[PDB]
Amino acid sequence: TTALVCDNGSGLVKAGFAGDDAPRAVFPSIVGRPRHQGVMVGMGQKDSYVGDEAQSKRGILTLKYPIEHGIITNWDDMEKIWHHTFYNELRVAPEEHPTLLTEAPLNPKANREKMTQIMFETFNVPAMYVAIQAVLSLYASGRTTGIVLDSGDGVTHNVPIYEGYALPHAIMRLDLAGRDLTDYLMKILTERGYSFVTTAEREIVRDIKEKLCYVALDFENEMATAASSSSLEKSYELPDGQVITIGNERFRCPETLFQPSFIGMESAGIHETTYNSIMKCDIDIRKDLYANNVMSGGTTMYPGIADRMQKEITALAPSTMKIKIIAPPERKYSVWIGGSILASLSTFQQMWITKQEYDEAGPSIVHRKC
Amino acid sequence: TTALVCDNGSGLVKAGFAGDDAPRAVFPSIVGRPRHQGVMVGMGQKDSYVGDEAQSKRGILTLKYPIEHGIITNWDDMEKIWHHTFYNELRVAPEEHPTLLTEAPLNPKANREKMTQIMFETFNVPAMYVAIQAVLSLYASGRTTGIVLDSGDGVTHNVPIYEGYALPHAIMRLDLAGRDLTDYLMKILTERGYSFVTTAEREIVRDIKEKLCYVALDFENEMATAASSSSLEKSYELPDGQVITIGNERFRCPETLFQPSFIGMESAGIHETTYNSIMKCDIDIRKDLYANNVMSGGTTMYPGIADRMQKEITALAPSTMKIKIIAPPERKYSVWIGGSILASLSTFQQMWITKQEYDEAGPSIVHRKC
Amino acid sequence: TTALVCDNGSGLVKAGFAGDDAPRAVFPSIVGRPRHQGVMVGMGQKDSYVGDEAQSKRGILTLKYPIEHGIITNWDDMEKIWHHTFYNELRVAPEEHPTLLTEAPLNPKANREKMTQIMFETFNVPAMYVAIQAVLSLYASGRTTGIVLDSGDGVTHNVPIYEGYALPHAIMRLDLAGRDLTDYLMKILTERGYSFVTTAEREIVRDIKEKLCYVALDFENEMATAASSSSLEKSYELPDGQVITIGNERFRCPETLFQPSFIGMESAGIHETTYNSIMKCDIDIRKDLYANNVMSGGTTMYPGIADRMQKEITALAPSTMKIKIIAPPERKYSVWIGGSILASLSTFQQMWITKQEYDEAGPSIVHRKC
Amino acid sequence: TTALVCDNGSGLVKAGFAGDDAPRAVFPSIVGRPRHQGVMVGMGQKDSYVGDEAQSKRGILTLKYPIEHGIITNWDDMEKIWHHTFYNELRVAPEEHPTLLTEAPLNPKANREKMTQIMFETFNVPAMYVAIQAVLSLYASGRTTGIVLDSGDGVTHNVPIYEGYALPHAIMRLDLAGRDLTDYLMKILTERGYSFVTTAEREIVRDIKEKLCYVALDFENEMATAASSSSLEKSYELPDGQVITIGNERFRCPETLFQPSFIGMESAGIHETTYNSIMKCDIDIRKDLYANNVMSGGTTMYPGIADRMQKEITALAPSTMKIKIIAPPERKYSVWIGGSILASLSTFQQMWITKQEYDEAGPSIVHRKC
Amino acid sequence: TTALVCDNGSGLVKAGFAGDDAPRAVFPSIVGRPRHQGVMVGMGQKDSYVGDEAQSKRGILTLKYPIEHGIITNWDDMEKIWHHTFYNELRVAPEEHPTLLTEAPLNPKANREKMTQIMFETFNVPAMYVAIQAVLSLYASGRTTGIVLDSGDGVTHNVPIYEGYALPHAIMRLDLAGRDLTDYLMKILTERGYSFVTTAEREIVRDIKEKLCYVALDFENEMATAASSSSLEKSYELPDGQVITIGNERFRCPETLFQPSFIGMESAGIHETTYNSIMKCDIDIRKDLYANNVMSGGTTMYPGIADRMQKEITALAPSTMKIKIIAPPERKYSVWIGGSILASLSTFQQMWITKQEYDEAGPSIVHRKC
């Protein structure tokens, strides 16, 4: 009866039933093969470790993400993570409840085809559907009008949606996301005397960026304050026991979202892609899209990103237009919230692709249906 | 008991009961099909949108006019607009009150035949009548003598009417109207750096022409003032937030009414067709037609069109004759005013074509009756 | 008690009571049917228009004269004009006052019979009488001796009358009158660039001939003056506003009265028919008829017609005889003046044909009585 | 030695030498100024285009007729057409061969004066003559007795001619001709959905009337056949590629020749003007004029016009009289045939007005001579 | 003596002398600022790179087009490109030979004014002229009649031209051109696993579209062949060494020329705008415009675009009309060919705007002259 919604993101896998507020299953999407020979005999040494067990034993593992910027690079570990979150995390079978998968727009069709094939052949689900992460994150907002700024761990994409009709010709996609921010933070933290080279360590930098990084109102004056005094510096407690003192890196690595020239990308920052997509949209819907900029994803959780997004957009947009940046306090899981509120809808229950519909169509039904 | 009068114009549909001063229902006559796929599920997405709901959601629609220059191009959307203005706008049934339709002279008989067939078969009205827009606009003037300058959104026509006997052999018809003026304004506004290509945008140009365009007393001196200084330029507030600065376009696009060589037409302007029709009329009625030039329609609402019409006519007419241009302040709906004052007349109540009269006659009773 | 005198002429109907100087009712004798369909509903549109209401609304009517050259062509409109001048113009009933009708000599008996039948059957007058227009126009002169030159709109006739005994064997009749002059003026005005084809327009030419045409003392020298210079040309104010410049047409179309070869008639001019009738008269009354040439009718109102008539007659008559042309200043209505002065006479009151006399006699009493 | 005969008609200019059967030069009499700026440089763009070159390039021109209903409205283009037909069409000089011009009766003297002045001053012809179109069209018939029904493109006139003596007092002139028929066809073709507004298009309607229009034996029964079935409708191949389906318009627009109330004229049809002119003629020549009704002009080329003219005339004329309608198969150029057969006559060679005769007389010799 | 013709297009700058067949100077119109700091010292690092040097060093540059859809967005780089093509490419001075510039119709007057000001103030040319690209591309065809389908890199416009007189009221302009096709190809190539985000890469997609894209005879059957088998797929050699396998994208992105709904535009495809402009033209020139559809520009170089244009036009045009699509093998530079054949014309040598003419007129002489 109930439906499963599985937000297979690049950094986290939010999986839970339909009709509830919060996702019950949340864990990093990495698999870890044992790095060392393992002299001790017995104790249940396994070939792989998924999620929290990998996070706890990350010292002797070699963590890696199966999903790049949205595309699934490796498939065996992806279906392994799916089997894990289905059996060892939710303790349910896929043959009973329909599953709901999410993806980013401007996605290779091979990824969706392999998703459908894996879901229908290995697990044999009665029905499923492949929605868009940004559209669901807009559902969670309760409204139907406004452009969505969805930026997760691997991809940042924006799609403007009017009063039910979205604009596919203005869908912008930026490969700059949280993983690139973590890489830039690792690259700029070596200038302080802290080398993070290995994948296992990189997670420490990820947590440091998650709980110590913020976006400045403006770059120049915050640098001037960084240059003068240590009033800005703050210390962190490392798992090994040492302490580090980061200064301008607290707001320099989040600035890459607005100035991609730091990691080398030529793409316009997240504050300019939205304005360019709205300027590519229709001239009557711009008044409604300017005052509705729905943000989602874990990357939009920095303290002060909403204020800078606002300021930049009213700097780009005309003065008479008013800019509003909807910053929900549960925007980290807004995609899952939208999927769960979508799965309970009665009108949507008819457009699930079913096995009986899938047999004659093959793995190509997903493009024509979704 | 009461009778419905429905001025199914090319740009607006003025619909209301009989015996009242103002039409209660006024909205643009366009239907809009959804342009984009519509990813959001639910919320009441419809196949079409008529009138003000189309004007509000014109961003995602593709607006189009079912009526060209007076002829009804598409019939399904026309009867859809009729059903809309009957049920969702007036909340009345056509089976009870008789309806009154209007049309322009020199009209194809197929249009009137299809009008009668749709009104008698789909709605099954007890009685109806097809009058002429200019004759009704003259009724609204309270007088019976004078030529009528009726120019709406699709057609401009002139018919001289004496003390009850009109002259059908002098009925002039000009395909130049407000839609052509809007097209010319769109064509000449690209020279300033503002491209309006799509139908939805074109409505913005229509409102700009409605509330920023005027007709000059003479073209040459106003151009000389346009050439020298910006004393003439005025800014406009666009819905997107931007501002535009129009100069000579304020009086260049309304000049097409008097110089059709701008949009390419070879027809004499609205100031020469009236004089040629009066010169085609009888030699004793010219003295009464020269001093009575009743104007109507929304196109005759430009500031200064009455003065230029006067000046041009006394330039064409002999000097001893005096020219008067009746410019009523409610000439935008003068056709509807005349229809409503006509429907209350007791003598007219006998010449409605009824269903019992329509059965044996077929759809050809309208030509012999009206 | 009082008696009605009704001069039912070809161009005008002079109707009034007896014993007064001027006729109170004067209007053109034409009926006008509506030419156009008449789209406007109501306002009192009528089937016909008689007299001044037809003259005012002549633009949309098709005027026509019921009386040709003296004979009544159509009878329904004639009795309609009679009913009009009796009820809507004089506001009196024919059943009370006796009516007096006039006619031209050498008239078909059917016309007088139908006149008597209409007056006695439709209106039921107590008494009536059918006199001769020229005899009454001679009464108005106060004298009893002299030939009468009566020329109205349709017929020109001359009857010499001695000291009470008229000569019926010398009654000449010429079908050349004002209508033929108007037709000739219309035919010769097209050579200047002014086309008058329709009946309504023709009235404008009639007024132009009434107030701009004169008869020359001699044709040759006036042509020589017309040929040289524009000293003769004069302009006219048309009702439409235009102006025309007529030259030799001011005295060419009135010359038809003396040279009938212009409109094609073979009849001797009005200056030769009088001389031929006097030469057909008795040899002792010629001395009294030569010095008494009473003129009447509206056609004899041209400036200079009296002088030319004189000159022509003394050119035809012997030198020892003296020629006099009585040109009264009220000769336009001289027939009505004579009828009114005749109706007051006591001796005439006995010879009215009465209904009681009419019953047994039928419509043939008029020939034996009058 | 040879003489030029130039029938400067309202729609066509038939020009050729004398003594031959057919006119070598035939082309429409219109001049066309270039309507558009003409971006292409070179190629021989000219200020005007006359005749067939205007007909071929009528798309970018604005055609107009210098001759109205017989009067020459504009003189510069008229003398331009004369110079064209003299030099670029016949390749002859006017100084050598005498020219013969034609005109309609009841013509303004200014037109003939300007004709003579242009022919004697600009071209300096040795001699010329201004004849009448109907008299020449009667010459072409080989007989001398009979009334002529000459109806071209601008004027329809009738003049009865006996055994050498014509009757100028019975010359009727009707302004209804082929141009008015084309205008009526354009006005009544808009009821089928085909709008012809511009002058260039109007020529297409002219050809449609020339090769698809006929006159019915009677109006009522042909309408009854038009009302029932499409057995009457016929399609036409437009130059643009489209096809049209005309029904009752094939015989409705030619009916205007007999019922002028369609275009609004009050004049009696061509079947009543002839009878009224014959009834205005002499009573002994009516027997010879009834059996001789010579028709000419291009307007008399409709299939069935002869039969309807016959039927109408024997309906108007007495029964004992026999009516004959001479319908020659070359009546389209009968005026030119008569001019050419007239120019070869030896007796006519003496009455040409010569330059030596023209010097002292001025431009007024034409009225006294012709 | 010789004249310079400079086709400053949106994607390429064809510059060469007059009187020769091929343009000697051809290079992309982009400027590239150095993206990276440039650690190496010396070697001639420059602030900008224009044309082929930018194409060779595009890896470290950020290419951008100064011309949008025809309008010049940035002026400093535009005059820089002009100075480059004048000095570093042709090695000539502008002060000696007159220059000829081209532009698209329906162009903002500010662009032409700035063009004239830059050419007369910075370079001080003796004379110049601003022609239209489509008119020149028609000159290159050697004929004068036919509509031109000019579609370059930024704008597609159509102007019908008759035998020297063009029709400015039927000039259609479509903002869909090769740049939009390249953007659509980049958007649809991400579905195969190849992300092109940066401007430098986009040139690789441009070359892929130039040498691997074709237009199908019909969309449906070619999709059916694309769906079934890889018989359609073809590989490409990337500069980095990798190979790509494109399938339906070979004919899907060129279909945008006929179905603008792919990139979101509401404009009718290039096959419908031509038919709508011809239907807006005159009815006599349609027969000559249907059989003459001159194509030009680099976008019209796809294999099979001529056949599809033909088929679509005979599908829209009537059947009796014959459609011809002139597809010249040098239509990529047809505008330059026409400019060069135009500059050698003797008649055109008089209408160059000169400095002495420019002084008193200011930068506004270009509108009144060209």
Ligand SMILES: Nc1ncnc2c1ncn2[C@@H]1O[C@H](COP(=O)(O)OP(=O)(O)O)[C@@H](O)[C@H]1O
């Ligand atoms: N409190 C926080 N502040 C800043 N960044 C955060 C915070 N929490 C998570 N993130 C970043 O957001 C990313 C998670 O993205 P997520 O929303 O899970 O993407 P997806 O929905 O595609 O799985 C992490 O990589 C982390 O770097």
Ligand SMILES: Nc1ncnc2c1ncn2[C@@H]1O[C@H](COP(=O)(O)OP(=O)(O)O)[C@@H](O)[C@H]1O
């Ligand atoms: N205030 C105004 N000034 C100038 N033009 C106007 C104004 N209001 C309306 N119009 C023009 O008049 C047109 C409406 O014509 P309308 O009178 O409704 O025709 P119809 O009676 O046939 O419906 C509109 O297209 C608009 O361009």
Ligand SMILES: Nc1ncnc2c1ncn2[C@@H]1O[C@H](COP(=O)(O)OP(=O)(O)O)[C@@H](O)[C@H]1O
């Ligand atoms: N002032 C005038 N000068 C010249 N002609 C006139 C004048 N007034 C009237 N007429 C002519 O006289 C005619 C009127 O004739 P009228 O005497 O009324 O005849 P009847 O007595 O038979 O009615 C008119 O047709 C008009 O043409």
Ligand SMILES: Nc1ncnc2c1ncn2[C@@H]1O[C@H](COP(=O)(O)OP(=O)(O)O)[C@@H](O)[C@H]1O
């Ligand atoms: N075959 C035809 N059938 C009917 N009408 C025709 C035909 N040919 C020509 N006409 C009409 O006749 C007119 C030509 O008149 P025409 O005899 O040339 O007058 P004119 O002699 O004064 O030049 C044209 O306008 C055309 O409408």
Ligand SMILES: Nc1ncnc2c1ncn2[C@@H]1O[C@H](COP(=O)(O)OP(=O)(O)O)[C@@H](O)[C@H]1O
């Ligand atoms: N062989 C080809 N096949 C398809 N498209 C081409 C080819 N060559 C060039 N193009 C396209 O044509 C465009 C060049 O347009 P061009 O004719 O130079 O415009 P302009 O004349 O305005 O400079 C390029 O952007 C390219 O995409």
Ligand SMILES: [Mg+2]
């Ligand atoms: Mg995400």
Ligand SMILES: [Mg+2]
């Ligand atoms: Mg209207």
Ligand SMILES: [Mg+2]
């Ligand atoms: Mg009288």
Ligand SMILES: [Mg+2]
């Ligand atoms: Mg003729």
Ligand SMILES: [Mg+2]
């Ligand atoms: Mg180009």
